[PDB]
Design a protein around this nucleic acid. Sequence first.
RNA 1: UAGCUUCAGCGAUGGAUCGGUUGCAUCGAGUAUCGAUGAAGAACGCAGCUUGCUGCGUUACUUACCACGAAUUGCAGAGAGUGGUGAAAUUUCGAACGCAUAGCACCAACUGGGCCUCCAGUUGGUACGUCUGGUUCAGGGUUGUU
RNA 2: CUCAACCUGAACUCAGUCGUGAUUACCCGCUGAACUUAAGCAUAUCAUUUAGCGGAGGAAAAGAAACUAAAAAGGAUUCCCUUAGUAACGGCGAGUGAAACGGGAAGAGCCCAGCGCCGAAUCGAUCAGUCUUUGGCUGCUUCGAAAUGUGGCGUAUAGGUGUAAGUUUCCAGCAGUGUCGUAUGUCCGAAGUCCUUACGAUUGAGGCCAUAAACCAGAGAGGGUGCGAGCCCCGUUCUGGAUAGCGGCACUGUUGGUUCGCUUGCUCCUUGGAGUCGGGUUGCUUGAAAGUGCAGCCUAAAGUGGGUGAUAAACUUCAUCUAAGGCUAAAUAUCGACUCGAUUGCGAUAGCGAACAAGUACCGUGAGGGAAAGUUGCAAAGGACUUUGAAGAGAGAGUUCAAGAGAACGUGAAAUCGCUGGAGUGGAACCGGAGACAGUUGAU
RNA 3: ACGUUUCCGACCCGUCUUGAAACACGGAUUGCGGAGUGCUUGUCUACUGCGAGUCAAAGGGUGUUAAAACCUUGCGGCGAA
RNA 4: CAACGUGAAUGCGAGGUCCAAGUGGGCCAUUUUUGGUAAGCAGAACUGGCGCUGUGGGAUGAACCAAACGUGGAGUUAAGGU
RNA 5: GCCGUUGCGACAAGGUCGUAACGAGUAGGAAGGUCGUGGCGGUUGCGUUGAAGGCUGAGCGUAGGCUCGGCUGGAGCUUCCGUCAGUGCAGAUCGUAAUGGUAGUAGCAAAUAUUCAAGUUCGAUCCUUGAAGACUGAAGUGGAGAAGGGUUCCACGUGAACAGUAGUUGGAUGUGGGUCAGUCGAUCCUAAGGUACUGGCGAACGCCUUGUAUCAUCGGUGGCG
RNA 6: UUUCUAGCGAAACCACAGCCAAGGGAACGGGCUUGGCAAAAAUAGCGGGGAAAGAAGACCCUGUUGAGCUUGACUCUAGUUU
Lengths: 132, 204, 289
Amino acid sequence: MKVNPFVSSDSGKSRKAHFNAPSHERRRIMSAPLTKELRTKHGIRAIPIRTDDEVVVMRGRHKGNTGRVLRCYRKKFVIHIDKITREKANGSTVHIGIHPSKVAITKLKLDKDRRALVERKAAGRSRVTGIL
Amino acid sequence: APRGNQMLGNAHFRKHWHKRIKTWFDQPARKLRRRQNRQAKAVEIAPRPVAGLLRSVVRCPQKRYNTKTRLGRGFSLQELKAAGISQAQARTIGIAVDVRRTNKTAEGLKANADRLKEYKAKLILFPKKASAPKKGDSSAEELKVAAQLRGDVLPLSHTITFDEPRQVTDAERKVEIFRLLRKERADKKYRGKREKRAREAAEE
Amino acid sequence: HAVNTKAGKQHSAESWGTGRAVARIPRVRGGGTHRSGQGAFGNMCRGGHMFAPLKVFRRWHRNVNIAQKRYAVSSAIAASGIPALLQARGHVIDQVAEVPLVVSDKVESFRKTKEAVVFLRRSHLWADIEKVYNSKRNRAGKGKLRNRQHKQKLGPVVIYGQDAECARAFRNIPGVDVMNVERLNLLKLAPGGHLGRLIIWTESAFKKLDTIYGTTVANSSQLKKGWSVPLPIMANSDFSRIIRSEEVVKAIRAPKKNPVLPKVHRNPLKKRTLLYKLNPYASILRKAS
RNA sequence: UAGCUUCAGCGAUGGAUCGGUUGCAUCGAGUAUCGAUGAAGAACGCAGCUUGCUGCGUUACUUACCACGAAUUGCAGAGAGUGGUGAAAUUUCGAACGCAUAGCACCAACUGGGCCUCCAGUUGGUACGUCUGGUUCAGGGUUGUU
RNA sequence: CUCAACCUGAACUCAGUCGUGAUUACCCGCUGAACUUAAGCAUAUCAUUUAGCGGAGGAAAAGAAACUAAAAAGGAUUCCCUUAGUAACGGCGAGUGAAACGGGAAGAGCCCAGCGCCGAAUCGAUCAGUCUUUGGCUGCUUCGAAAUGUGGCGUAUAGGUGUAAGUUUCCAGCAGUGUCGUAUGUCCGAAGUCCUUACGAUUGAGGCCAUAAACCAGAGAGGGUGCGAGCCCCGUUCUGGAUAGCGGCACUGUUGGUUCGCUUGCUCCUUGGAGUCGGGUUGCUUGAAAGUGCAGCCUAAAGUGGGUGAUAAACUUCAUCUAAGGCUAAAUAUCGACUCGAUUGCGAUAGCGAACAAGUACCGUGAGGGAAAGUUGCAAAGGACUUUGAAGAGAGAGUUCAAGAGAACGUGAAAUCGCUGGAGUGGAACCGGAGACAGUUGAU
RNA sequence: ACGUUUCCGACCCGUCUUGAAACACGGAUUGCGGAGUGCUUGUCUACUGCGAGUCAAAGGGUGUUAAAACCUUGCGGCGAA
RNA sequence: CAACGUGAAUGCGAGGUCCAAGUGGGCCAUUUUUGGUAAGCAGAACUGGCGCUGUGGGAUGAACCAAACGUGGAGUUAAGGU
RNA sequence: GCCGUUGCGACAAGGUCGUAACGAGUAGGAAGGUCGUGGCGGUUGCGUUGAAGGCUGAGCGUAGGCUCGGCUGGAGCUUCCGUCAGUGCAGAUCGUAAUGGUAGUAGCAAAUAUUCAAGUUCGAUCCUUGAAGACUGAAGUGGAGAAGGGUUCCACGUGAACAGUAGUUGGAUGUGGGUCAGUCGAUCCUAAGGUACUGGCGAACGCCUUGUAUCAUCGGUGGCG
RNA sequence: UUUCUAGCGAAACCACAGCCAAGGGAACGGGCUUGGCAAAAAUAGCGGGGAAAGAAGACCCUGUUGAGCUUGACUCUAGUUU
């Protein structure tokens, strides 16, 4: 149970915040878990997903498929993955949106900022796990 | 249309009372707010007592209450002089001063003088500048014991005592109490008429 | 809770009167919108004020006698010591060692829900927590929409005497409450107003019980000025024992049956045997005839 | 036979009911911050395509700076974009201020018309009341001096 | 008559300021109804209230006794409980109606005029230095305000002189040192998407060494994810950590200013608000009753004087304050504004008028009036292509768990209506009781 | 059994009214909404606790599943003349 | 205080207190009866009815005759009839 | 015979049973309701292998209503114990939304009037061209303006809605285009009148006077410069 | 015009419905009792009935309901005279 008097356990408030969150907050909301191997490799559990990452679908009708994430449609709270597509009536091809919480990251797109973020998360995890 | 045996109605609801309505849904909130204010004041003025100034001992005005005592606004100038404290010293030491109250009886003056003396005995005075203590200033191991007092300073005691059993005396038994009371009433009632009769006799 | 004092009364509505072939309800004024000419104000009208709008100054809270509160708390505590009442209230106490269940003061030293769960499981109180887990469900009705999404069973209540911050070990276990013996809550001792909550007493709380609630001697309580355990109006509360006691058996008279009535009136004038049974001389008279 | 009524099955018209819910109602808590440095409100305008709503003000669905760190998305398109926000900017009416109140006019400089007494443009200024001080004054109102 | 002062009054696009207009929940001053009740109605009541006008703040106002009272007395203001539906008012009808004492929240005291002493010791602009410069400190700067008196002492507890004792600093800034708060930003966090099964999709069911066991739990609040999730994600717990900023404190340093005071005893001197109070009358107002409060007109003071002590007046015992000048936080009110947390409230005819391009569409010249309107699907995958038609549209087909979920799309009631089959059918039809027929259903 | 056919019975409900099937009024049909309530004050009654007492107010102390619960009254209300 | 003991018929349990609803337009009939020429008119007395009430009969009817009512069956009747 | 009420009674039970008599009812009063509805504190369970909701056969109960079956539907629902209530509709010329018979009915009849051939079109009484016949008849059914309207103006497309028949046409609808001033007006002057300043009044927002009420209200030639 | 046709297409009203005689009844029935009777579906007229529709009688009365107006009604008042 929450103890912070300034954190609301109101379902309506939670839903309103979730569905009106700005882009930078939707970035945090659209987080995906690392696979077991990558988790042991990097020391972190989950990270805000990013374009050009590599993931594997863990649930749904496309479970088991792998590919690179093309777009993070934050407005629609979904990510488009490479090769995860269907055909419209006319024949054109459309990517199927997948919620990042239902995939697992297999490889991180790392740059200066992403490396710094992963280092921060790993250090914090080490600290808290040592304390626990 | 009241019917049968009833108590005649008396409700005062003929005004537009819906415009003036007061609810008490914030009573616990007000309680918590006042507790928080007391805590903040205690932190601000520590180690001084939270209650604030010391108050005097008083007798309730009317004869319906004059057998009781309660806390007063402060100490009279006569009381301060008897206890050997200046008004300015009392102000800086944290003693309430009642500039309006005046003493007309030795017992009432002495009760508050004793209260002031006891407070002065219990008082702990910190150095004005911590480095250099002065005269009248409390000692270091005394200052180490200083703690904030909560509630009224020198709270009064409202316990009732019973007089010790004694022997009934013949002088006590021989008095006519009812006749004495009636005699006092008659004397007070007829004082003026007797004075008028005496004046008329003197003129004659 | 209350409705807005001006709800349904924000229209400059007037009645059309008679002669217009419509009901005399007040109607919205103006034109050019569908609202114009529609009924207003009345509780029968769409958009009007409800009947007797609920007011905010209703009698929400109650004054409860302190003596009756203490009586209720004591009765709940006493009922917690009856295994049958716990089963009736639905607690699983099949393998519980004893009722009341007193436990060593070490439980007050717990700091981890792992420790608490191990203690419960070894004490055989995990059946109640599993029943709570199975009992969690969706609440039926509008309560779901009002931050009351789920309904689930209540588990045991651990009562401690000297808090070594032991409640932390128990907070996260569903259905398990924690209380301090000094301030015992009737709302948690008898949830739903029903007797027989399952209580885990620590040694300190069990020892302090007498100090707090006193005994049957008047003014025996020290932390409740003038309070003492109430006396019963019936000494022996089992109705069959008195009935079958030797004194009552001696006084009682032997049981009887329902009185028997003839029920059916037959026709001796038409029959022979009945008439002769009632009047044997009739047979002699007929013989003479 | 048809029509009418009725029963069973099927289908229309209609939008009741049920199922939640970024909405509403009430209770409680914390804070004190509008305006001539131009408020509240109104009008008009601003987007590559965008009427309305929302946002913004001629730097006009926003500039700068700082934090985070890869998007926006309907189609295009090319330290993103979000959040904070201390720098800069903030149209016209409006207490609304040159006078009037949907119009016209005065002062100064500078620039252009070739010159300029005449035009045009830009900039700055010209409201009512009031306080303090300044300058120039009026009155046999009182007084002194020639 | 010349010149020079003062007084009074002007003009300035003179130098520098200030006011106006908004907001309504609370606050302060005015103005001020009627409906209604009295079973009629005029006093009364509604009500010293809707409506109208003006003026502020974060609170406002009030406030340090011309008080309460009659004890062995209390001692500013504000607020709560109680006093109490009491005293009292009232066509004494209907009705109205306080306060002190008592228990508590909070508590903080002071400044003038006058008398007296110093007597311009005081102050604003401007100039020049100087600093930590949206403001401060210094002056032979130059002007001006001020003797029709600015400043210092000093105000009912008085006060002052002298004297004897004791005792003697205080403000504001800057820098540092820590100590503590922040509805202040940013960053950081424990454990299964494990096996079997179910599903369109699992979070659903079962199993995960162990006597006590999948694992975490100081985290089993909430939300999202293909209804169901502590363990998939954001989050939650850590009376959370790191970091930057704001503050408050305590101590050190340092800059500027400032301190002949302060208390108690003795001595001598000294000590106060006028068209105001009070009185008459008039009107309103109050529970205030031979006048509670306010105001108009007339009258109009005194100095142990004046006010008050609730029944008016004289003559008497006293008691208690010191009016006609001023400042002052806290406890208190209030969601109108900004930001938050909740609920035994409503669940789209309900709840705000407004869950949605709602104070919108639309209406009225205007003041103003004022709606209806939520729902495809997990995902548009929003029906390619063939075929008839000019087209709407239809017949195939495809997508989909599903389209009889196909765009006005969740569900899809009743009224009403069309078709197919059966049966009845002479100016009503429906209905209760009792059979028959058709039909339905049961038989170890 | 809201199907058909027979025999008997069979006037349209609500309302005011002495009297309604009425040539008395409302009602074309269906869905949804729709009316003895809240509070203050009395009285009686039922139940519960204590009992010459009882209830305690504002308030204070505590309480973090903290608007709850728990503790707390020279004094106050009602009662005891 | 001492004695005496239930003194007409028939039927039958009796008494007390509190709280409160609706009503406060009535109408009809045998007999008596006032006003009126009379009235299905107006006003009274006793009792019974309708109002509040269905049922058999009077072809029909608020009041007339019979008789008052749970839901069914058998038998017998009332008024009335064949 | 059965149901229930009343009285009495038996039984170790807020219950069962026995027994005798009884059973009208408006206004009204009580009692029972495992009759029904929505919450809360608890308790008992069901659910994408199908909840609520909806339609409707086998039964149960004197009744209020309830259980089950079949179909539709797609996410919630429920037993029992206490307690609470925005708790039950046939009416109120009730509110609101929708729908019938009337009924393919009343009706679409003032302003003289149209016809022929052709064009376009899937399609022409109604659009266009030509020919004919009529009408307004210059105080017009003509040509232009003021107020008002605000794009209705012009061109090209048009399928639905609208044009109370129709429509290929349109003041409709979609996409574009269009208003050029030294001389035409406004702009300038004042009329009736309005509204400011002072002044007075007013508790106040502000009002009254446009007047010797108020009033120190300026500007013109020239010289000098 | 109506009429018939093509196209288009309302409203009032509606407890349920529509043949009569007499009876009795709220004293003038479409329904009730006894009789007369009683055969689809319709078109054009019609104004006897539906005590037909329009409107909570504008006539009369009641209400301790109003309003306009008047005065020798009660109580006040601007203004004016002293």
